[PDB]
Design a protein around this ligand. Sequence first.
Ligand SMILES: O=C(O)[C@@H](O)[C@H](O)[C@@H](O)[C@@H](O)C(=O)O
Ligand SMILES: O=C(O)[C@@H](O)[C@H](O)[C@@H](O)[C@@H](O)C(=O)O
Ligand SMILES: [Mg+2]
Ligand SMILES: [Mg+2]
Lengths: 395, 395
Amino acid sequence: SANSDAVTYAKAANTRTAAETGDRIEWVKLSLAFLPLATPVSDAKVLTGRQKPLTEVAIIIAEIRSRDGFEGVGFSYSKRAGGQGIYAHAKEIADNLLGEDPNDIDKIYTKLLWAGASVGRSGMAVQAISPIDIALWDMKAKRAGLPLAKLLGAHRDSVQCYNTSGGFLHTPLDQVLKNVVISRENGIGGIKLAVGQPNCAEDIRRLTAVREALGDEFPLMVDANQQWDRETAIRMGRKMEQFNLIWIEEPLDAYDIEGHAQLAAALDTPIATGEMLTSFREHEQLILGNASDFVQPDAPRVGGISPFLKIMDLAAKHGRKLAPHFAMEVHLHLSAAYPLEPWLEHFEWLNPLFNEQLELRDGRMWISDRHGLGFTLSEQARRWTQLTCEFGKRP
Amino acid sequence: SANSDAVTYAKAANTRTAAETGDRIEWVKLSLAFLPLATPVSDAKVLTGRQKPLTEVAIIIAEIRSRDGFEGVGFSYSKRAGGQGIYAHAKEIADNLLGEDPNDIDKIYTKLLWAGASVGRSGMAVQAISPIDIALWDMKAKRAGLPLAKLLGAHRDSVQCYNTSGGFLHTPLDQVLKNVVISRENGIGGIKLAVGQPNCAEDIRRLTAVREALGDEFPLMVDANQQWDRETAIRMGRKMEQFNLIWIEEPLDAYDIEGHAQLAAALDTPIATGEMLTSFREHEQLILGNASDFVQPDAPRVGGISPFLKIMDLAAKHGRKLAPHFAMEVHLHLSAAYPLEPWLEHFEWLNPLFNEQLELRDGRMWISDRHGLGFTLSEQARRWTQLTCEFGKRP
Ligand SMILES: O=C(O)[C@@H](O)[C@H](O)[C@@H](O)[C@@H](O)C(=O)O
Ligand SMILES: O=C(O)[C@@H](O)[C@H](O)[C@@H](O)[C@@H](O)C(=O)O
Ligand SMILES: [Mg+2]
Ligand SMILES: [Mg+2]
């Protein structure tokens, strides 16, 4: 009998609790490095005078070591001003990590938010938490002896990949075409052309020239970087229907929800946006407002893997596709865990930071058998480091 | 420099892929057992004539072993008819598990759903997937060398606990009071009284008597098991405002969303419901309808841990508290991962199925250091097995 007239309580032997036997964070190292770009990069934002050419990328790295011998590495970044503040805030809160059980990632995330309650739950502050949140996930995966994608649960072992770095606006049409062949010869699965420059006639020129070389089937997409007004948007979009694009990215201001929704409803061509958003809440607004067919969150920018997962689930409920922005070293795993077939964006920019490189085969990026994110920092990463600080003591 | 006038591509050395190195399921064992209840249990569902007293509990157990030596165990249950069906379906689809990477839990779930597409994505079919889904989560946690709660990431190391098995309707008042003392003496953190019997006057008598015995502060709650109609629910609700209960559980039919919402808005006392729901979508309709203050999902009933996690995220997003129903062996880990302070429900019924017992101290149930769920099947569980089948070959 499993019961009786009166209630009965059992007795346990192993009185050891998970609280007293868990691992503990003992050391943390933060670094602010700068990825130099010999060739200044220009997208529509530069062509319209909104910003100056990009000449480098700030990278904020977090390395965490546990008492039991596990290590996690993660990073956040900034294109243009932001790296100094992200590093500074991370440095002012990292101390809170010492002594915590590295497995309670969200409990830690919460403690970090409370420590910086005055500066919000979105934007820079959470971007200061991203490298730490990502390092903790990296650690958990390693603890389990699995690539991050497998710790989360994968739906695919590889992800379609397209290249962006070779289609910017500071690049003459002839070079863009030269980059296309190089990219295809290397097994890229798609090409994204940066558009949205004052001269609309030119973007059409450059765009028609690319579609010609690639043929009719090769996945092609465009990105206006928020440089069109509603009128131009629908106009250009309606005209671009003759390219069967995978998507039209950021046709309008990142916060113009109704404008994007309107565009998405008026065109068969999918609309993509969200890379500039810096929190789950911001992405939720775009999603509830049916702003786009493709959601493009950025783990470092939204606060790390933890918030990114929430964004993924929400997008999934609304049947939206996923096309993460930048940092493929982290997004490869996240997009591998997405229910619907995603797209991965490719840049070579971060390659020199790591000792390993991802495998690009037949239009797809394959997940290696390496644990966690599957990357180790290179000598170059240390050379490019300008500021660093440590907490605790190496176990 | 990290970039150039053209586009650059590196090359990967470590050519091994996660696809070719992942673990693989090689053996699966399913069992249908019956937990005997020598003392027939009856709540309001019996006193109103809807059902007959409960005399046993069906238990569907799944055991999975991987090529690399990992093992996982999980289960679902059925109070009254349903167990033969759950077992029958699990047996008809289990074979699909062989050769699958056990870490891709959602991927496997989807494959199992397609294997039985004809029978839906809710109800019995997912309750047949439950044992398997739970076993896989149990396996992943063990692979990481962590209690399930830590694999998920805990917000607490113990959870407030209340007893239910001592306050049922087939139990005379004085016996209930006796169980209360016994329960309180064993360190219980709360008491739930079964109400909703035809004689409303008699429940008030029992409720008053219990509140008197427990004192003013001790956590007390009631459960009507869907036996009131809207008129009675509100009437009993006003009348109970005085006892300052932690919550009023299932005052109406489990699918009367507007009814619950109306009671929730009308009363200060929290309203709880959800134990009868059998899928994420079902719970989602109640949550989007603002039906209750406390959401009470049942992992075995909703399809396992995977869907239970989505229910948690949805509930959290709407600021609702969590109070999982039954199966404390699994819910301890899930509730520990909930961001808002949850409640765990205690029954002794399943204690004999496992060799290990949970530690109850100071009104809370503590998570032990044992990995995965932290339970191994006892011999008594084998004694109570009526049917069983196996697939593959034990590695
Ligand atoms: O989708 C992308 O990768 C681009 O949208 C880049 O974020 C680009 O703006 C950036 O590299 C820049 O040039 O400012
Ligand atoms: O919340 C509870 O514990 C109850 O709601 C039980 O599920 C009860 O109905 C069941 O044990 C029964 O007697 O039918
Ligand atoms: Mg872009
Ligand atoms: Mg109940």
